[PDB]
Amino acid sequence: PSSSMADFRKFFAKAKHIVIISGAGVSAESGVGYWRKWQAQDLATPLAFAHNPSRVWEFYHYRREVMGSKEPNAGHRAIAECETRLGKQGRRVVVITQNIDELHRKAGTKNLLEIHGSLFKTRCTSCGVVAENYKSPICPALSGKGAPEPGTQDASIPVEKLPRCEEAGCGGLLRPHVVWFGENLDPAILEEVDRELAHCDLCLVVGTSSVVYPAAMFAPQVAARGVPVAEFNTETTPATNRFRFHFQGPCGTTLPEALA
Ligand SMILES: Nc1ncnc2c1ncn2[C@@H]1O[C@H](COP(=O)(O)OP(=O)(O)OC[C@H]2O[C@@H](O)[C@H](O)[C@@H]2O)[C@@H](O)[C@H]1O
Numbered sequence: 001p002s003s004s005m006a007d008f009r010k011f012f013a014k015a016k017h018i019v020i021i022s023g024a025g026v027s028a029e030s031g032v033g034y035w036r037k038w039q040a041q042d043l044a045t046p047l048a049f050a051h052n053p054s055r056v057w058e059f060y061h062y063r064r065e066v067m068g069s070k071e072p073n074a075g076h077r078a079i080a081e082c083e084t085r086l087g088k089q090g091r092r093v094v095v096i097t098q099n100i101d102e103l104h105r106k107a108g109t110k111n112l113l114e115i116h117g118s119l120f121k122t123r124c125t126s127c128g129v130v131a132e133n134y135k136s137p138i139c140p141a142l143s144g145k146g147a148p149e150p151g152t153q154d155a156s157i158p159v160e161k162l163p164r165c166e167e168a169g170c171g172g173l174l175r176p177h178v179v180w181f182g183e184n185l186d187p188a189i190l191e192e193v194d195r196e197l198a199h200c201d202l203c204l205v206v207g208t209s210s211v212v213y214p215a216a217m218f219a220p221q222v223a224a225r226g227v228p229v230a231e232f233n234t235e236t237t238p239a240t241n242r243f244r245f246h247f248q249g250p251c252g253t254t255l256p257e258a259l260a
């Protein structure tokens with residue numbers, strides 16, 4: 001895999017359709033552990049939610065509230081500025097993210113496929129309706145709840161006071177619209193993804209470990225068509241040798257240059 005910025009820029013100057021796949025590394029420079037005695041694998045499951053809907057909500061309230069505090073970094077801003085600039089030229093730029101933090105959106109990204117959901121979306125467990133939700137707090141019973149520090153315990157909010165569906169006559173319990181461990185990704189989103197990968201002529205893979213499916217396989221799918229894929233990561237990954245470029249470093253340094 002090459003590290004030639006100049007050779008990358010030749011492709012970038014001419015690309016009609018850029019796909020940018022992002023993961024958690026893209027938000028590292030925005031300052032985005034354990035929450036109380038648990039890690040994500042113990043909370044972000046349907047079984048956890050079924051057993052303690054209040055505790056899973058405290059956890060999601062806390063993450064939503066922390067986000068309000070976080071700012072997109074130079075990486076997220078370079079990606080958003082790119083889309084705005086090319087779009088004045090009829091050139092397409094889309095972001096396919098694994099992240100649920102919505103910092104791409106806060107940076108000004110408009111073409112965004114969020115394959116794992118969003119902290120800022122809800123789904124009704126009764127009627128299935130999805131909606132956006134930016135309210136701090138999401139419900140008054142969660143106000144001040146979710147503190148991760150030692151000495152905090154379960155709020156034990158009765159389920160009828162947790163977020164509820166406003167559809168007429170529904171009244172159901174809402175959950176975060178995020179893909180939990182064990183759950184399938186939405187088939188409709190994956191078709192939109194397949195369409196973007198098939199049609200792109202330059203692909204960037206940014207801050208992802210490239211080992212978690214199905215996103216692990218997106219950039220290799222593109223590189224297999226003979227399209228250049230550029231990886232932007234602090235380290236090599238197991239997929240690195242499948243790609244045309246590798247640009248090592250924090251993406252807040254390397255992206256503003258590559259996408260200038
Ligand atoms: N500043 C940075 N710039 C670029 N890359 C970085 C930076 N900091 C870390 N990275 C890289 O980001 C990657 C982070 O990998 P993961 O934490 O595995 O995140 P991601 O690939 O998004 O995980 C996939 C999925 O796994 C689940 O845990 C979660 O649902 C996530 O969506 C690593 O390859 C790491 O080198």
Ligand SMILES: [Zn+2]
Pocket residue numbers: 124125126127128129165166167170171172
């Ligand atoms: Zn409902």
